[PDB]
Structures are given as structure tokens and as C-alpha cells.
Design a protein around this ligand. Structure first.
Ligand SMILES: [Cl-]
Ligand SMILES: [Th+4]
Length: 173
């Protein structure tokens, strides 16, 4: 493949004074953009949800729930606190085959309605990045969507790498 290069981290803001306890709970993925994310009219991406649970030791247990082949699929991972509040690395990285690097940065959030989170990983020596627009509900405003599109474009993503998953009711309620 050919991939749009990951942006330097200097183009990716960090939420100031990030509050780990307030970021906990369920978030819906209302927007998704990345260098391996592709818009698809034939079968448009369904919304999924991600649950953040703050463990005793201040890492997150992170569970994603997706409706796929008539069933609920669960993906679990551990985000370990990084150099600053709002940054994380992936726990137990040796148990993910091909994975040499995984970085999470919370870009912005108001905790009770929305968040943007930046992800970067190196897998099979290929550098992938994505931005998730999270909502506490399945809908967000035009203003928040446009902010997410503007930000995604500042990182070099064109429109067809920016998707808005369609709301569903299976699995994620
Ligand atoms: Cl996610
Ligand atoms: Th992943």
C-alpha cells in the first residue's frame, strides 16, 4: 500500500489538565478519520462504542463493542499513562503480532458531551494514524463535526478519509 504519512506530534494538541476520572464511561464513535480509513457507500461504517474504565493503578481498560455478522464483537485493550496527562501507550504490546508502537493522545474533551482522540501505531513497519470523534450521545452538532473535519484536514487527510458512522441500536445501547 501507499499511506498518507503520520503528522508530527506538534500538529496534535493535548487536552490541557486532562481529568482521567471524568473521561471514563461509554463514548460513541460519531466520527472517524485516518490514513487507512476509507469512505464506503456500498457498506457504510456502522457506529460502535468504546468504554473507558479507570483501573486502580490509573491505566484504562478499554472495551469496544461493534455490531458485526448479527453479533456483538468485543475488543479489549489497556491504555497505560504516558509522559503527560491525556497520553497513553498500549499495554502488553508483545501480545499484538506485528505491533511495534502504539500512541494515544486526547486532543480535546468537555467530558460530558464530546472528545477527539488521536491514535498512532506502527504495525508490520507501516505507520497508521487515526482520529476519533467521540460523543456521549449518538448525535453531535454541526459545529463539532466541522471542527473534526478541519482538524483531520490539518493532519493531511482528504475528505474521503473522514467518515461519520451511521447510528444503530444493536450492541451499543
Ligand atoms: Cl475507539
Ligand atoms: Th485498533
Amino acid at each position: 500500500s501507499d499511506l498518507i504519512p503520520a503528522p508530527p506530534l506538534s500538529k496534535v494538541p493535548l487536552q490541557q489538565n486532562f481529568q482521567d476520572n471524568q473521561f471514563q464511561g461509554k463514548w460513541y464513535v460519531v466520527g472517524l478519520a485516518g490514513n487507512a480509513i476509507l469512505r464506503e457507500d456500498k457498506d457504510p461504517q456502522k457506529m460502535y462504542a468504546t468504554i473507558y474504565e479507570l483501573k486502580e493503578d490509573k491505566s484504562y481498560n478499554v472495551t469496544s463493542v461493534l455490531f458485526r455478522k448479527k453479533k456483538c464483537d468485543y475488543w479489549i485493550r489497556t491504555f497505560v499513562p504516558g509522559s503527560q496527562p491525556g497520553e497513553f501507550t498500549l499495554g502488553n504490546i508483545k501480545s499484538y503480532p506485528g505491533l511495534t508502537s502504539y500512541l494515544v493522545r486526547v486532543v480535546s474533551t468537555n467530558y460530558n458531551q464530546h472528545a477527539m482522540v488521536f491514535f498512532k501505531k506502527v504495525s508490520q513497519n507501516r505507520e497508521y494514524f487515526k482520529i476519533t470523534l467521540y460523543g456521549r450521545t449518538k448525535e453531535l452538532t454541526s459545529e463539532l463535526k466541522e471542527n473534526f473535519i478541519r482538524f483531520s484536514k490539518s493532519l493531511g487527510l482528504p475528505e474521503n478519509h473522514i467518515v461519520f458512522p451511521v447510528p444503530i441500536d444493536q450492541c451499543i445501547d
